Each structure stands twice: as structure tokens, then as C-alpha cells.
Design a protein around this ligand. Structure first.
Ligand SMILES: Nc1nc2c(ncn2[C@@H]2O[C@H](COP(=O)(O)OP(=O)(O)O)[C@@H](O)[C@H]2O)c(=O)[nH]1
Ligand SMILES: Nc1nc2c(ncn2[C@@H]2O[C@H](COP(=O)(O)OP(=O)(O)O)[C@@H](O)[C@H]2O)c(=O)[nH]1
Ligand SMILES: [Mg+2]
Ligand SMILES: [Mg+2]
Lengths: 311, 160, 311
């Protein structure tokens, strides 16, 4: 198995992938067409589904039978990262289907998902995709751990994509197997926390990636925590998580970007996130909903034929 | 404590202060200035103990005083010397006999018990309480800026 | 320093000032002409800018170099109150410039600002002036705390001005330094809350001035709270603000108008306010926008000369 396999789906996933092409063979991209394929993608894996050239209900029956074929192109790995938009038609279908397959592999993985906010279609898709991940968490009895990134009004997709790529790199660093005290089994039991803590409920959880003790301590109701420290003198057993582990980073590890990084999983935060999306959409729809069309310009007097022709 | 007036709390504190003023009024049988000093400065003679923040508990029954956990140093005042009972397990213990003509004598017995294995919880309650409150106020999410890179903003932030 | 200095700008500010002339020397008025100067103003300070006899972009370059001169006429004070319309050309420029200068003094102050609603010009100005205050909050790293008063349809400017003057008096009372338990430093740390709470973001905040516990508790996401009580038995530590202080008013204080007054600062309320203005203007513009001029009454046949003369 490789150390980590990175999986990207849909346009948003393709776009984020462009920022991670230096990871090469470890990167696997999937989409239903080539609208988002650019030259830099030659450096990574790209697979497009057949017969599929925004509506998830339409895309699902077309792509479902192809999933096994997609999975054969994804090597066995010690950890996976999955990335896509919750709000489109392709990423939000391919992403969760592949995620279900990773759960069947008994894999350790996290996802980076975008809350798209443009339209009621985006918002509806966001809701259905979050519900999808919840259903998968239940059906596979496994936490589905996601770093949720909302497209906040006024912020460029470029900016958001940059932030996501930088977080993905921290996870790639986390799982690089080069830290003192930190095992592949330690990582597995961090993210698959219900395996050994059977009294906990598998569900959609959030991943919070923080670079200070203060920010990490402020994650509410933390369930499972992993901390990396460059200066082992700064290690402090803070917070109240059920599961906690620490790794010591190496100063000659060129990928070490920060002095300490905390990866905190909780789940009592997704609620609000969803509420904000529902409330925001409601307000927007209310302004556009409150409509009142005018009366028909044609009366029962006009002679209209079967094609609606009035001659 | 939530819901209690500062007036009420202040009244309670003043009444406790008066009991300490009474304690140290130097008019009690058997009780020295040195006895008081060695009660509160207990590490002076008990060098194996650790100086740290300790709590003072001021109780008017044997039962309440006995319920102070891990008592370190204890001073008891009694008006009725027949009621003196050497209770508890403190490291240091002293008794004074109050005088019935002492007009400041408010209670029949008063126990001043010092311990330190109680401050912890107190702090925890404050940290936990604040955390919960902050969590409700923290979980915030501001909206996007109402100004875009399109607007011409000058050094004072003026948009004309 | 004086206890409080009151600053009024533009026509609306001048108009509100007329109701506060009893405060005399403490009142300082500024405008670009004398259209709003009346006899009662003799009782207060009035300064008119030079060479300036509705368009903020036009007024700004004229008045900017004069600000230092205006500031020299404003005494050092322990607290300031600033008042102007967001929707005109003069108040909405002088007001924020002076506000910026007060921030440079490291001053404690609040503003009373009017949301003007007559026209798309008013509404555009309202938006740009709110954005101005936000930019100032950021640039000076200080909350810019305003009591926002919209000119609601059908309500007289007289009525609105009366309400503003009565609120200003409550703030004058608040900062009169005659209350038990309440310091000048307490007031400063209430309104300049980011000074000691560095994890908070300086931005435009609203000031809510309420005379019941119930109304004050209903301010959403309260940040910083100051309560005055005449009956100290009624003091209740309600709400969830980050900062809270109480003062006890004196029954022989002739300025004591109410039994309890709560001054609550939040910021998750300005949004809606702005939305209402944008939505309202949009609807109005839509009705006036949907226009369709007629064809030119002149054809390429007419002999038109350089001055457009057809002889
Ligand atoms: N953060 C981010 N959001 C995007 C990007 N592209 C599109 N979006 C948002 O995500 C939604 C789904 O787009 P996309 O991922 O291309 O859809 P899909 O190809 O059907 O999976 C769009 O409607 C946008 O709101 C991107 O590059 N970054
Ligand atoms: N509440 C209130 N609003 C006013 C008053 N006078 C004008 N307005 C509104 O505020 C806008 C700006 O007027 P004004 O303050 O005189 O403009 P400025 O002198 O250029 O600052 C007007 O277009 C009106 O909509 C007033 O006395 N009270
Ligand atoms: Mg697409
Ligand atoms: Mg004017």
C-alpha cells in the first residue's frame, strides 16, 4: 500500500487538484466530462466516466454501475483524502460513492467538501449530499470525517481552493509516517474512532485543523484529537477528547510547515453549518419567491390549434 | 452564584469577616496570638507541608466542620466548654473558650477550618461554566464583506 | 478633558442638535453651508467649512484638508457622541472623517446615524457610508459602534429626530461619571472592547438602548453590555455578552429618566438592516427602471449645425 491516496471528484475537485499536481501518482481525479481538465493534470491520474457528457438524481444511475471500474484504478493505501463540492451534480455523486467503497475497504480517510452557495440548486444539493454522508456513516457504521468549507459570499473560488490545498498538505504531512511516536494504527484509530469506542455513534463529523493550542481547545465537544509538535517541550495534554495522540515532527522534514498542528474531530458543529445554509437560502428564496405573474394574454376566444398556433 | 444579588453576597462576606474579627480579638481562654499565627501560617512549624492557596471554611456546627475534606489546620471556638469535641483529622488543631459577656459572641461554636483540596473543583466549575457560555456565543459566522475590490477606497476608507 | 463632547454633522446633525442646545458648550456642529443653521444654534458651537457652498465624492476632496482645523476646535473629552445622516453628502463625509480622527485620539465614542430612504442617491450613500465606517473600524482596529435609525416610510423627520435626541440624552446620562461602581475606564472598555478582547474582530457594531431586561436580553449575539439601575435590588446578570458592567444611578440625579437602562453592543444585526435598504431600493428602482424611451424626433435628414440648431 502507498502512504496516502488523494481522490478528487467533479469540477471543484479537479480545480483543487491543479494545486497539488506535485504529488503526482498519488493523486486520482474523477469527473463525468472534461470541462475542468487542464494541461497540468497530465501529471496526475484522470478518469472520466462513460456516457455522461448539475442534477445528482440524473447522474447517479449513469455512474453507479461504473464505480467498481473506478475503484480498480485506486491503489490500496494506508490513508485516503477525498475532495469535492457538495453542491454540484458530479462531485457530489462520485465523491460519496467512492467514499462508500473506501468504507468497505475498512479504510482510514478524511474528506474536504465545499458548501456551494450560488443558488437554491447548490443549496439543495449541499443538503442532500450531507445527508448522503450521514446515511453512509450509519450504513457502514463508520465516522465520515469532513473538513467543511463554505463558499462565503465575496470570496473567490481561487482563495477557497488555495485554503483547501494547504489543509490537504497538512493532512499529507500528518500521515507521512515519519513522526516520532505516531503509528499507522494511531492514525487509523483517530479517524475510525468507533472501532474501539463502540459506545459512540458513527455519523458525519467535522475535521478541524488548527495551528495553535488555543484554537484547538476551542473546538466544541471534541471527540478525537491528534497533535503534531516540532518542539516536544511544547506538548500540552489539553482539551477533553475521548481519544488523544501526539506525534513529534522532525526539523529536517522539509514538509514541516508549522511548529504545531492539531487535527481535532467533533460532530456537534455540522448542525449550525447546515442551519446557516438553510436560513440563507430561505431568505434568498423569499425575495425571489414572493412573485405574482400576470393574467394570460390569450382568451378562450382565440382559435388555438394543437401546436398552439393562432392563425 | 447566578441569580444571587451582590448585596446578599456582600452581606454574607461581612458576617464572615466579623467572625474572624471575633476569632482574633485576643479575649478567648486558651487562645494565644501565637496559636492564631501557627494556625494560618501552618508551614512555619510543619515544614513537610507545601505552601499553596488554601481555603478557609467558617462553620457553626461540628457536623459541617467535620465535612471539610482533607482538613489541614483547625481552630474551634466554644461558648459552652462542655461541648468541646476533638473531631476531624487535621494536622494542627486548637481550641478557644469564648466569654458569655463578650458582646461580639454571635454563635455558640465557630470552627475555622483550612484545607486546600477544594480549590480545584471551584476553579473547574468556573472554567466549565465559562466554556459553555463561550461555546454558545463563540459558534458565530459573520457575513461576507459588503465592499468589493471594485470600490475605490482611499487611505481613510472613504468611498466617494 | 470634559465629560462628553457631542459632535453633529450635516443637515440632519444640525437638526438633531437644535433639540440639545441646553447642553451648550459641549455641543459642536459642522456643515458645509448654513442651510440648516437656525437661531437656537447660537447656544452651541457651529463651524462651517470653507469653499463648500449631496454628492460625497465631490465634497470629500474639498473638506478633507480642513479636518485638522476642525479637530482643533474639538476639546479632549472622556467620551464623544457623533451624529449625522448616512444618506446625504456633507454629514456622511464630515461625520466619518471626524470619527477617524477620534479613533486616532484612542477615544471612546458612539455614533447615532440615520438611514435615509428617499431616493437611490440616499440609499447609495447609506451603503457607501456604512462601508466607510467598516473600513475605518478595520484600519483603526477599533469597533465603530452606532445606533442605527432608519427613516421608516410615513414617519416624520421630526419624530425620528426626537427619538434620537432622547437616546443621546441617555448616553449623556450614562457617561456623566456620577454612578456607583461605574468608572471612566469601565465605559472605555465597554465600547473599545477589542482593546482587552484581542480575539474579537473590530467592525461596525450596533448600539441598542433598552429600558427593560426583556428587550435587552432579546439583542442577538450581544458582545458588550452596560446596565444602569436606580433600584439596586433589580440587578440581574442576564444575557451572554463577553463583557458586562453595571452602574447604580442616584435618585437625586435629576437626569435619571428611567429606572433601568441597558446599553447593549452587538454586530450580527447590521447585515439585515443593510439588506432591507438594498431590497427596498431594488424594488423601487425596478418600478422606475423598467422604462422605454421613444424614437428620436429628428432624422439624419435635418440639417443640424454644431450647436444643434435646425434652421
Ligand atoms: N470552492 C470552489 N467552489 C466551486 C468551484 N467551482 C464551482 N464551485 C461551486 O461549486 C458548485 C459545483 O460546481 P462543480 O464542483 O464544478 O460541480 P460538479 O462538477 O457537478 O461536481 C458550483 O455551482 C459553485 O457554486 C471551485 O473551484 N472552488
Ligand atoms: N431623520 C432625519 N432625516 C433627515 C433630516 N433631514 C434630511 N433627512 C434625510 O437625510 C438625507 C440627508 O440630508 P442631510 O443630513 O441634510 O444631508 P447633508 O447635509 O448633505 O449631510 C435627506 O435626503 C433625507 O432623506 C432630519 O432632520 N431627520
Ligand atoms: Mg462539472
Ligand atoms: Mg446639507
Amino acid at each position: 500500500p502507498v502512504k496516502v491516496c488523494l481522490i478528487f471528484a467533479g469540477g471543484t475537485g479537479m480545480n483543487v487538484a491543479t494545486k497539488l499536481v506535485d504529488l503526482g501518482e498519488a493523486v486520482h481525479c474523477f469527473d463525468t466530462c472534461d470541462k475542468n481538465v487542464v494541461d497540468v493534470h497530465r501529471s496526475v491520474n484522470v478518469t472520466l466516466t462513460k456516457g455522461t457528457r448539475g442534477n445528482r438524481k440524473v447522474i447517479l444511475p449513469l455512474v453507479r454501475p461504473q464505480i467498481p471500474a473506478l475503484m480498480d484504478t485506486i491503489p490500496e493505501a494506508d490513508f485516503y483524502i477525498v475532495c469535492y463540492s457538495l453542491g454540484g451534480g458530479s462531485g457530489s455523486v462520485l465523491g460519496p460513492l467512492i467514499t462508500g467503497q473506501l468504507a468497505d475497504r475498512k479504510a482510514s480517510f478524511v474528506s474536504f467538501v465545499v458548501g456551494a452557495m450560488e443558488s437554491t440548486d447548490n443549496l439543495g444539493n449541499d443538503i442532500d449530499t450531507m445527508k448522503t454522508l450521514e446515511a453512509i456513516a450509519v450504513n457502514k457504521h463508520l465516522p465520515i470525517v469532513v473538513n467543511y468549507v463554505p463558499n462565503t459570499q465575496g470570496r473567490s473560488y481561487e482563495s477557497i481552493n488555495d485554503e483547501i490545498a494547504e489543509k490537504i498538505r497538512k493532512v499529507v504531512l500528518l500521515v507521512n509516517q515519519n513522526h516520532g511516536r505516531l503509528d499507522v494504527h494511531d492514525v487509523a484509530n483517530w479517524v475510525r474512532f468507533t472501532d474501539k469506542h463502540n459506545y459512540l455513534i458513527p455519523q458525519v463529523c467535522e475535521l478541524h485543523i488548527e495551528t495553535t493550542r488555543k484554537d484547538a481547545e476551542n473546538v466544541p465537544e471534541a471527540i478525537s484529537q491528534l497533535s503534531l509538535y516540532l518542539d516536544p517541550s511544547k506538548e500540552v495534554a489539553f482539551g477533553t477528547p475521548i481519544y488523544r495522540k501526539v506525534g513529534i515532527m522532525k526539523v529536517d522534514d522539509l514538509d514541516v510547515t508549522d511548529d504545531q498542528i492539531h487535527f481535532v474531530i467533533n460532530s456537534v458543529g455540522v448542525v449550525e453549518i447546515m442551519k446557516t445554509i438553510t436560513d440563507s437560502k430561505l431568505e434568498m428564496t423569499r425575495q425571489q419567491s414572493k412573485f405574482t405573474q400576470r393574467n394570460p394574454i390569450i382568451d378562450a376566444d382565440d382559435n388555438v390549434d394543437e401546436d398552439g398556433m393562432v392563425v
